[PDB]
Amino acid sequence: GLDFPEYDGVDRVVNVNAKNYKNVFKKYEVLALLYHEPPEDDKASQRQFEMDELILELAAQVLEDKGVGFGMVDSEKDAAVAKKLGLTEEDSVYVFKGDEVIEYDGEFSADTLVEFLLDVLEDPVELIEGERELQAFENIEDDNKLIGYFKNKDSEHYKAYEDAAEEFHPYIPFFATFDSKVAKKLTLKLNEIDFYEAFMEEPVTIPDKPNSEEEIVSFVEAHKRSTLRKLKPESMYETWEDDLDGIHIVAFAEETDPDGYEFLETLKAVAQDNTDNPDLSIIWIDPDDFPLLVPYWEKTFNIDLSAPQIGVVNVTDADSVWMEMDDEEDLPSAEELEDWLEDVLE
Amino acid sequence: GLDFPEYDGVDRVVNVNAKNYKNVFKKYEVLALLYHEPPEDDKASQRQFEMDELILELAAQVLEDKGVGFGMVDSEKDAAVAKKLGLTEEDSVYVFKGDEVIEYDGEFSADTLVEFLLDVLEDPVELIEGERELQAFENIEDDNKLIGYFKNKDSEHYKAYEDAAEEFHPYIPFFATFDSKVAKKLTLKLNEIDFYEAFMEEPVTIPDKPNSEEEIVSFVEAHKRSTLRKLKPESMYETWEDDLDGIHIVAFAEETDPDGYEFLETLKAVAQDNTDNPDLSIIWIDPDDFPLLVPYWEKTFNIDLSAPQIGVVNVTDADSVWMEMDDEEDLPSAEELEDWLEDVLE
Numbered sequence: 044g045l046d047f048p049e050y051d052g053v054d055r056v057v058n059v060n061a062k063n064y065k066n067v068f069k070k071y072e073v074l075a076l077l078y079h080e081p082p083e084d085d086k087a088s089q090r091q092f093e094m095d096e097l098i099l100e101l102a103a104q105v106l107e108d109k110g111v112g113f114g115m116v117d118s119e120k121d122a123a124v125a126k127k128l129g130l131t132e133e134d135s136v137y138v139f140k141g142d143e144v145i146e147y148d149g150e151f152s153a154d155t156l157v158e159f160l161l162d163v164l165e166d167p168v169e170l171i172e173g174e175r176e177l178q179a180f181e182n183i184e185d186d187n188k189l190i191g192y193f194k195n196k197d198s199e200h201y202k203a204y205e206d207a208a209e210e211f212h213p214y215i216p217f218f219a220t221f222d223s224k225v226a227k228k229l230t231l232k233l234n235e236i237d238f239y240e241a242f243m244e245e246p247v248t249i250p251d252k253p254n255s256e257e258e259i260v261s262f263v264e265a266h267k268r269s270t271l272r273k274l275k276p277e278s279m280y281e282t283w284e285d286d287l288d289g290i291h292i293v294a295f296a297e298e299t300d301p302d303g304y305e306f307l308e309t310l311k312a313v314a315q316d317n318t319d320n321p322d323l324s325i326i327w328i329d330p331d332d333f334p335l336l337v338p339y340w341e342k343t344f345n346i347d348l349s350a351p352q353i354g355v356v357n358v359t360d361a362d363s364v365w366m367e368m369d370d371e372e373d374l375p376s377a378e379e380l381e382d383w384l385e386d387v388l389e
Numbered sequence: 390g391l392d393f394p395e396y397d398g399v400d401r402v403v404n405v406n407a408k409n410y411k412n413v414f415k416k417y418e419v420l421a422l423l424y425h426e427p428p429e430d431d432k433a434s435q436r437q438f439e440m441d442e443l444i445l446e447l448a449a450q451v452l453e454d455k456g457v458g459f460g461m462v463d464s465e466k467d468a469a470v471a472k473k474l475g476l477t478e479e480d481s482v483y484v485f486k487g488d489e490v491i492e493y494d495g496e497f498s499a500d501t502l503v504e505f506l507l508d509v510l511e512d513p514v515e516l517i518e519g520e521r522e523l524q525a526f527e528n529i530e531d532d533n534k535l536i537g538y539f540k541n542k543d544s545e546h547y548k549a550y551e552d553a554a555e556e557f558h559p560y561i562p563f564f565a566t567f568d569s570k571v572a573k574k575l576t577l578k579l580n581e582i583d584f585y586e587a588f589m590e591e592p593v594t595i596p597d598k599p600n601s602e603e604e605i606v607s608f609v610e611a612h613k614r615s616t617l618r619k620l621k622p623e624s625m626y627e628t629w630e631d632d633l634d635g636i637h638i639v640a641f642a643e644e645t646d647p648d649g650y651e652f653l654e655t656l657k658a659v660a661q662d663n664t665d666n667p668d669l670s671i672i673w674i675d676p677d678d679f680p681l682l683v684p685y686w687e688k689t690f691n692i693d694l695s696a697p698q699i700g701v702v703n704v705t706d707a708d709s710v711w712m713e714m715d716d717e718e719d720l721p722s723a724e725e726l727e728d729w730l731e732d733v734l735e
């Protein structure tokens with residue numbers, strides 16, 4: 044029978060240098076550039092560099108037909124190109140779509156990169172027309188989302204909303220509808236924009252509508268750090284490095300597992316009860332999203348990720364404390380969680 | 390501060406040859422061997438071979454602490470070793486756990502390989518004691534599962550049950566209880582074994598209890614092909630190559646998406662209504678499980694995997710037919726699906 048697709052071994056990652064970098068940007072709508080330090084001469088360093096190149100090669104093969112290019116910029120050999128393009132963070136990926144530039148800070152894998160770039164290709168604002176499109180919108184809960192009601196696609200207040208959407212694309216989805224019926228179900232006046240914090244039932248409306256590009260961006264910046272945030276591969280590093288006071292409240296819960304789903308519903312509740320605390324942000328990690336880190340997590344934290352967990356992690360040395368839970372008795376409720384949090388921090 | 394783990398570039402994949410293969414099998418509890426053809430000389434083939442070596446290297450690093458080794462066996466240079474070990478399927482992975490041998494036939498990626506090998510390390514039979522462990526068992530539906538009720542692990546009929554579990558480890562989970570309360574909830578007599586076909590509400594009891602090792606293996610062999618099957622990466626190739634009559638009924642549905650969950654519930658219903666048809670076998674593909682194949686699938690089948698799909702695929706040329714659904718009307722019902730498949734097949 045016909046075989047599944049496979050990596051064909053063809054090289055597609057452009058070696059970007061001073062003479063071709065201008066042609067490359069014109070060739071591709073979306074361009075992903077790995078800004079890297081010159082590979083050390085030792086064996087292991089040469090292998091690490093090799094792994095990262097092939098990951099780009101595999102991604103380039105997948106996204107060749109959709110017009111996504113992949114390039115490498117050497118921090119010394121191509122230093123002038125780094126200067127003209129603004130590549131500062133060493134050993135990191137930059138994504139270019141038309142004008143805007145995205146400083147990728149997520150997992151460096153073929154799966155995650157292709158997913159992220161496919162989201163990048165999409166327009167910054169997604170429209171909602173039928174009730175099924177609204178019902179899909181109302182079901183999002185692991186991303187902060189915005190919804191606005193505007194008269195037409197040509198409205199001046201919509202372009203400001205769209206321009207603001209470009210500042211957070213694709214991490215934070217921006218939705219808009221021109222159907223008053225959908226707007227009525229959401230209690231959205233004309234040109235009003237609602238911000239739904241992740242895992243929160245009731246939204247927050249942006250004051251002083253209509254809103255300009257700057258008013259929207261300022262609002263999102265002040266509200267993007269949700270009280271409960273999910274560790275997603277597209278942004279795991281940005282999220283983890285955003286520690287409040289040198290520690291993270293980490294909770295492991297497998298959504299598909301019954302014990303994991305129940306424990307998550309408790310977390311959502313604790314977050315809803317304490318959503319106004321400006322210093323509280325809990326990281327939810329679904330171990331199913333990071334299969335390669337599970338053994339490392341069980342080893343470092345001395346926990347069994349087959350059962351739900353919650354703890355405090357020192358981001359400096361990975362020192363940790365974890366709430367103990369009985370495998371026979373029922374899982375702790377919001378009351379027990381709120382009390383366990385207050386004690387370990389006091 | 391502290392960095393996430395990374396590939397360190399150290400080589401851990403053993404070059405298995407006639408002089409070391411016996412020492413290797415004594416070193417590791419679980420050993421995965423890539424039986425591979427000698428690498429071709431061209432550039433592209435040299436990259437493909439390189440890609441596959443690093444994927445093994447990445448898994449070798451993740452599972453070093455848990456005692457899992459990784460080796461490569463060349464079909465010509467190590468042909469005598471392949472002879473002694475029984476490595477016939479070229480360019481494929483063989484996993485050895487003590488005595489048993491598992492002929493891996495799944496996705497060749499680090500994520501899937503580590504997930505699979507971690508399941509191999511687990512014992513073949515998982516026990517159920519409390520109420521929470523029971524409810525976790527009852528939630529499984531994408532795997533065929535077995536459950537038996539015995540007196541204790543020293544029982545003769547439990548040891549026969551455990552020996553049979555090794556023949557299907559870890560693809561088919563074998564569960565067992567010694568708790569009479571749990572047995573009552575499952576309507577299980579003593580030494581009775583219930584077989585829950587995937588996506589089915591009611592089990593099938595193995596007749597002529599108590600059952601021997603061979604009676605169980607035979608029963609599972611005759612029931613392994615569930616009427617509805619999920620394409621899982623650990624076994625995607627085995628599933629796909631098991632064409633009914635040179636064709637597959639393929640259904641795409643993203644479980645987390647509301648429209649995909651409903652269409653899956655409809656699929657579950659259609660499967661339950663025809664579970665006694667020996668020829669009907671539907672493959673369910675969750676596009677979230679195969680992010681690198683989504684562009685290839687949308688291009689080949691001319692479908693949009695953001696909406697649920699169902700169709701018939703010729704396994705020889707990837708020719709296909711797909712049920713058109715309106716993006717504004719409600720999703721098709723079980724009857725409408727039964728009406729579309731029987732129509733295209735007649």
Ligand SMILES: *[C@@H]1O[C@H](CO)[C@@H](O[C@@H]2O[C@H](CO)[C@@H](O)[C@H](O)[C@H]2NC(C)=O)[C@H](O)[C@H]1NC(C)=O
Pocket residue numbers: 635636703704705706708
């Ligand atoms: C699936 O497609 C294959 C070809 O891609 C079909 O096989 C051909 O069938 C015709 C007559 O049916 C023969 O003349 C050709 O020689 C066959 N070619 C090959 C390569 O097998 C097959 O019939 C199709 N299956 C269905 C169910 O339509």
Ligand SMILES: *[C@@H]1O[C@H](CO)[C@@H](O)[C@H](O)[C@H]1NC(C)=O
Pocket residue numbers: 288289290357358359360362
């Ligand atoms: C984290 O660990 C460091 C030592 O590595 C220690 O100095 C610091 O105080 C710890 N932080 C907290 C919040 O305990």
Ligand SMILES: [Ca+2]
Pocket residue numbers: 058059060115116117121
């Ligand atoms: Ca370069």
Ligand SMILES: [Ca+2]
Pocket residue numbers: 162186213214215216
């Ligand atoms: Ca997103």
Ligand SMILES: [Ca+2]
Pocket residue numbers: 229230231232248
């Ligand atoms: Ca309002």
Ligand SMILES: [Ca+2]
Pocket residue numbers: 250251252253254255
């Ligand atoms: Ca205003």
Ligand SMILES: [Ca+2]
Pocket residue numbers: 240268269270318319320
């Ligand atoms: Ca909040």
Ligand SMILES: [Ca+2]
Pocket residue numbers: 403404405406461462463467
């Ligand atoms: Ca070898």
Ligand SMILES: [Ca+2]
Pocket residue numbers: 508559560561562
């Ligand atoms: Ca399994």
Ligand SMILES: [Ca+2]
Pocket residue numbers: 575576577578594
């Ligand atoms: Ca029964």
Ligand SMILES: [Ca+2]
Pocket residue numbers: 597598599600601
């Ligand atoms: Ca008998």
Ligand SMILES: [Ca+2]
Pocket residue numbers: 586614615616664665
């Ligand atoms: Ca059946």
